[PDB]
Amino acid sequence: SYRKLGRTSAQRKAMLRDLTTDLIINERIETTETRAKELRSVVEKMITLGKRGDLHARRQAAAYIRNEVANEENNQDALQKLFSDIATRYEERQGGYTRIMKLGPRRGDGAPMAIIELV
Amino acid sequence: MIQQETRLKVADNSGAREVLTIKVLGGSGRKTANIGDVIVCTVKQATPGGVVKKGEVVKAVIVRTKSGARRSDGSYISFDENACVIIRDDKSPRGTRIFGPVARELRENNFMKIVSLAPEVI
Amino acid sequence: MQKLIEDITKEQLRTDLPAFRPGDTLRVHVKVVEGNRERIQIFEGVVIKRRGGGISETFTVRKISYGVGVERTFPVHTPKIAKIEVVRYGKVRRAKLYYLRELRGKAARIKEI
Amino acid sequence: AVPFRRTSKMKKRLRRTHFKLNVPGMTECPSCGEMKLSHRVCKACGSYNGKDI
Amino acid sequence: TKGILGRKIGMTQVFAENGDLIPVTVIEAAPNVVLQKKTAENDGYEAIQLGFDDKREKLSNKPEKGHVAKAETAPKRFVKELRGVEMDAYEVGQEVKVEIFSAGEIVDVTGVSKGKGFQGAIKRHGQSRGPMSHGSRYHRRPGSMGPVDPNRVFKGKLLPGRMGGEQITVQNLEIVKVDAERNLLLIKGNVPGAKKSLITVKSAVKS
RNA sequence: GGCACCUCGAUGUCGGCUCAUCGCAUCCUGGGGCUGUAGUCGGUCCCAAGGGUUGGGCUGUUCGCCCAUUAAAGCGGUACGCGAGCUGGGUUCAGAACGUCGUGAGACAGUUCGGUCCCUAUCCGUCGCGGGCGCAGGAAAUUUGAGAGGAGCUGUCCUUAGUACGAGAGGACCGGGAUGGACGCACCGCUGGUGUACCAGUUGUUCUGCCAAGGGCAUCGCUGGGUAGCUAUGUGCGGACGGGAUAAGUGCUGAAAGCAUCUAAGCAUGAAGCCCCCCUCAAGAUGAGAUUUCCCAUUCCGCAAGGAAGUAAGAUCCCUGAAAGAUGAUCAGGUUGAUAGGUCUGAGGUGGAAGUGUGGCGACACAUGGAGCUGACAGAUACUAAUCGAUCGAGGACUUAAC
Ligand SMILES: O=C(N[C@H](CO)[C@H](O)c1ccc([N+](=O)[O-])cc1)C(Cl)Cl
Ligand SMILES: [K+]
Ligand SMILES: [K+]
Ligand SMILES: [K+]
Ligand SMILES: [K+]
Ligand SMILES: [K+]
Ligand SMILES: [K+]
Ligand SMILES: [K+]
Ligand SMILES: [Mg+2]
Ligand SMILES: [Mg+2]
Ligand SMILES: [Mg+2]
Ligand SMILES: [Mg+2]
Ligand SMILES: [Mg+2]
Ligand SMILES: [Mg+2]
Ligand SMILES: [Mg+2]
Ligand SMILES: [Mg+2]
């Protein structure tokens, strides 16, 4: 099983890709708890490609990650950060690259929010 | 799986070329016939010359199906077509010859005459 | 793959079968028990399909017999098969050759490898 | 389909027996001492599991 | 009567000696323990209480630990009674293993069927649909609730509701193989329930 | 049909569809008597309502006729059952036309072509699912079964036996055995279906600067496959053996009534039916049952009665989830933890990645290499999240009897 998150197949993929790149860039995002729970598996699978490091793994990641600037100073893309900084940080760690922390409901819709961050 | 309205090719030289299934025999509310089962059928297309003629109500035994048959050893047989053979009430073929392969299941259902006349029995 | 299910059924896996793939032409030597006698009937044809795993793995072989296409599906590890000879290795581009069901003659031919 | 009869005050009240909020699943924060939801970050001090988030 | 509790592992298939392919359910039944003997004197009826599947000590409680103390065994996850057994054959603490059964023996198999959740009258009760075209606005509805005269619906007008999750017995299944080493029964055919669910295997009541 | 008693501040009307349920005057199957019952078939009447009781052609039809089956194709009731469940072909609005009648407007149980079917369920009722309290302490399990529901159908073939029977023709009972139809229950190992976060091919355009490799959109763009799950057309199994009491029927012994007589006393036999046997629910069965095990008699007021407060065993909140699920619930777990994710190794699926090299003018091919990729499946692994906590929960009435 996997969550649908109230979106069509394409909308959901697009959202998970957006969130995946957001977490790579920011290292810590706030979203709905259920979005965060789906994002764990997707992001950790991207980090696995990063840790592999080979061209084939990079092109697989490039099919998923958005073309967004990670570091404006260095002119580093999100894909480049994944294969440089993130992959290096989690060289010795075997899985569990993210953690979710629950924040409680937001005002407008009572939606249970969460921080998801790189460990 | 042959039911009422299913058309079959005729795998013999009896005259009939195509039949339409009127009835699957062998019980009230029986929907489907398979290889070995007898059907009542009308001849829709006939060879102009032969014994069996167009519009005749005849009995026929199903010798090949697309749906096919399962065997006790876990193996299956399937054909590319649904085909039958026009028979008498004593299960003898009205035609003299059988065309194309037939299933081994005909031996189990006591259609030895058709099995004997068939070019291949699979 | 429950290891338990493999371990129970490992005894009945045949070791003598050749490596074949969909597209390859086989001679399947099928043991037929017509009453008393146990004769062998060869089914020569193209492997259109191979599915499942372990003891539940099956394969389907297709041949044209007296102008009528015939398919026989077998369990891979059935003791009813005496022998499988690979006649000819095929050059195909997919696991399931269901497109062959429509074709006939030169269109239905497969390139040898 | 419409109400055949109006609902009495009693029956309305009986129906609303279960139409009720529960008390939040709350515990004292070990950092700051304000109540927080169990398994959630404390909104007051930003702590969770003895760590500032 | 004989019986044993096991878990449903799953299904596979076995080639018989004659070359027939038999579908089998694999039931793993690690040795059951007789926890209690109920008697006509004390309980008003004769039965043995079989315990199956060793639970962790944390997951057990003091009531459970005291109950299994006479049998001198760990607390058991699944506890069920067998009636119609020979009381003198069993003793409290005795192991009941899969080799009580042998290949060829005819058994009844009881389990809880798989849950389907809230299901409509077509799926739940096998009812017919109304037409899908020809102006129809009647597809998967449950049919007339009944005649006018009663001014009420009769009991047993079948309707949507929770389907499955019910105790089911399948009768007259054959034991194909008994693996005493691995604590397995291979039973011909299919039995109720999800994988990992509790299956009771008993000698067939109609045999 | 008669009558005009309810309804004209509306009780929708034929046929079909969906769902049935009841009666028995029984269509089939079960048991019988009589027969102008040789046998095989039948006829007729009796008992019997357990289950079963078909697909089509024509017609709006019901009905009916016909085709082909079937053990049989029962007859009726339930607002000619069922339109706040469906349909709307017919009937029965407005258009138009034919025949006919009418000077005419028009009209016709004459015909013809076309013609809006509304409603978010309050209550009872029905089907599921929770919460509460009860059940003289508080708990965790296992249970008895008052009671209730389900199931209940039947063919063909072989054998007995070409025997009994019969001039032949034909051809049994009773009893064995095999295998179906329809129906039901379960399940996905098999055959298939689906499978919108699996794999591959491919068109147009657009973007990642370009090549190469990819992304977006076009029904999942389209096409070919397909894992788990859910599934039938797939597979397994079921209605088996019986027992008790009966119906019609058959009697035994037997008088009233020297005889006779199944009946008055007495004693038998005997149906698919009844009650069990089989399957499921079930102690709110307030008549609240039973068994096993656990906790253990605390601290306060208040004269006591009783109340209040911490707790025990135990359970919950909250959290990780799925074999469960609308939500509750259920079930697996909550760190001496494999509950989920990730990770690692597999299974299965796809079918040969990218990069590089080689061959070719090139499309492309071959090699590296059953490769690469891989939701849900299996195992292992505390890397991530199941943190810290909080709440609830006994101290057991009286009487009598026996110890
Ligand atoms: O007239 C109606 N129904 C009346 C009650 O008001 C009644 O039920 C009725 C129905 C049909 C009928 N007929 O077919 O002659 C006569 C009266 C309305 Cl439903 Cl339109
Ligand atoms: K009226
Ligand atoms: K009946
Ligand atoms: K209507
Ligand atoms: K109404
Ligand atoms: K009411
Ligand atoms: K399947
Ligand atoms: K009780
Ligand atoms: Mg799209
Ligand atoms: Mg972004
Ligand atoms: Mg394969
Ligand atoms: Mg229908
Ligand atoms: Mg519709
Ligand atoms: Mg009433
Ligand atoms: Mg009248
Ligand atoms: Mg009057």
Ligand SMILES: [Mg+2]
């Ligand atoms: Mg009114």
Ligand SMILES: [Mg+2]
């Ligand atoms: Mg009667």
Ligand SMILES: [Mg+2]
């Ligand atoms: Mg009516």
Ligand SMILES: [Mg+2]
């Ligand atoms: Mg109505």
Ligand SMILES: [Mg+2]
């Ligand atoms: Mg005139």
Ligand SMILES: [Mg+2]
């Ligand atoms: Mg009129």
Ligand SMILES: [Mg+2]
């Ligand atoms: Mg009872």
Ligand SMILES: [Mg+2]
């Ligand atoms: Mg009651």
Ligand SMILES: [Mg+2]
């Ligand atoms: Mg599977």
Ligand SMILES: [Mg+2]
């Ligand atoms: Mg499948």
Ligand SMILES: [Mg+2]
């Ligand atoms: Mg390009």
Ligand SMILES: [Mg+2]
């Ligand atoms: Mg665009």
Ligand SMILES: [Mg+2]
């Ligand atoms: Mg009790």
Ligand SMILES: [Zn+2]
């Ligand atoms: Zn705090």
